[PDB]
């Protein structure tokens, strides 16, 4: 079910407590390994965006060594709740070594700090900051990704829904990576995996009341991209969907990319067998071979979509 | 349940009859149309196998070229370089490998063990002239789609009971592994588009017209011993969702993880048997991806 890599660490992770437990830590990011290795090499210019709803995004542009460069701009997933540049380092690390571009990461307000709707319009400002101030910045704001992971493919997607209700521009391409679509409804697979290890059902529903203390939040498009109109949801960018097999929330990407297709979207939908949630992330994992690959493809994909 | 190419391909060739029955075309290949500039191409007569004779096709692009050998589908009965050539030329473009491409005879012209003893002195032909060709032998990979991935483990299989060098590594498309036994997704998909229960059982009869036959690991990689798989070499699984097979490509990367061969495995949503070579599917988004995948996970695994 599981391949040795990924069982390994699913093993060494029910001896952990629910990190996703009162109290929080004041700190939610840092790095996993620290290496302290590269030898992807990028410069780092650190932001301090005066746009969003509380008056400050902080943002990290990362761009790769060596006439524009393409983008991506990058959602972190982590429940709302966790992660940041520090422990997302090995994933943007990746991304910029297969996309060849730069790095654009909205390191949003994290929950209970701000709610629903405060991170999506962050990192929605964040992205229209970008499509202004992007090109003296040595970035091509026409030739821009969107990326997510779980929470930040909830973030990707509605970021994508305000555009289109907002008429400003979509990205060219977008990736979500087993992306939270539908926090008001618990499809099939919720059942299916209730401690199916690396993410529990019972920590799904505790960064859900953080993100969205009101319930009657979840079944807002803004918030839950997958109950978006048809009308709207037809619009949206060529979008990568791709998903671990044992996922309580891997029925929510396979059902969103259906729907993309339905409409008449280019959706690429791909399952990742005998991996856990956060693959994508979580640096043990990422080198299993299912993940390795679609962590390979998804950088790929931006390269060949990106110009 | 299908993109809009796959299903508006489908809905297409849903009148079409199927190419699995009698009377069979003197021909069995031809191009999917119409009419390289990427890569050069040479003939190689193999004085080799049961028949003394294997046809093989070098593909190289524009020191030593990686090299992957490829057995390409067609349950048996079709294909050849032509209907082959987009998946070719996708796989040179993205992996930057030659391809030894592996012309066995089709079936009933010949049958199982013919094909698999073929591709397996195809490739030790390789192992020892490769050098000498412009391509690294010690650098190779293993490719094959359908009867092409039932061929290519196959190969791999032989490999392992015989003692002769595995290659770096080895990509299954929707692979026929167990041609015995009928899988959940037979039930599942027995009509649905792109592949039929009735094709499968056709291919079977003639390539395997003996049911005991199915039994052999030979035959089906997928039945061979824990002790022999676990020596497989790293492997890359990709499947279509809706396949009557699909399920056989699955049990067979769950083995492979078990017994602690690396195994990626992939499903891809809403897309069918063939989307790897049948070139109207090829720019299906999903099919696009995967085809990038397994060209680009071959430029990685070889060097």
Redesign the interface.
């Known amino acids: 079910?599981?391949?040795?890599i990924t069982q390994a660490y699913a093993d060494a992770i029910s001896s952990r407590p629910s990190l996703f437990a009162f109290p929080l830590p004041e700190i939610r990011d840092g790095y996993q390994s620290n290496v302290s290795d590269p030898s992807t090499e990028f410069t780092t210019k650190i932001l301090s965006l005066p746009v969003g709803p509380t008056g400050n995004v902080t943002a990290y542009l990362y761009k790769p060594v060596s006439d524009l460069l393409p983008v991506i701009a990058y959602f972190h997933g982590g429940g709302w709740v966790f992660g940041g540049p520090k422990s997302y380092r090995g994933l943007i690390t990746n991304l910029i070594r297969e996309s060849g571009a730069a790095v654009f990461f909205v390191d949003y307000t994290l929950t209970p700090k701000v709610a629903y709707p405060v991170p999506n319009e962050q990192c929605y400002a964040a992205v229209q900051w970008l499509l202004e101030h992007g090109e003296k910045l040595g970035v091509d704001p026409t030739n821009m990704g969107f990326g997510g992971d779980s929470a930040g493919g909830e973030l990707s997607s509605s970021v994508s829904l305000l555009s289109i209700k907002r008429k400003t521009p979509l990205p060219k391409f977008q990736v979500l990576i087993y992306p939270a679509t539908d926090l008001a409804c618990e499809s099939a697979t919720f059942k299916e995996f209730p401690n199916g290890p690396g993410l529990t059902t019972d920590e799904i529903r505790f960064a859900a009341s953080l993100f969205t203390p009101d319930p009657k939040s979840r079944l807002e498009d803004v918030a839950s991209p997958g109950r978006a109109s048809d009308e709207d949801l037809a619009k949206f960018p060529?979008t990568?969907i791709v998903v671990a097999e044992v996922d309580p929330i891997r029925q929510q990407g396979?059902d969103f990319?259906?729907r993309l297709?339905k409409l008449?979207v280019?959706?690429?939908?791909?399952?990742?067998?005998?991996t856990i949630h956060g693959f994508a992330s979580i640096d043990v994992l990422s080198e299993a071979?299912?993940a390795?690959?679609?962590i390979?493809?998804i950088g790929?994909?931006f390269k060949?979509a990106l110009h």
């Open positions: 079910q599981l391949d040795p060529e990568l396979e990319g259906r297709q008449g280019r959706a690429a939908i791909i399952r990742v067998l005998g071979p299912g390795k690959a679609t390979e493809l790929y994909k060949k």
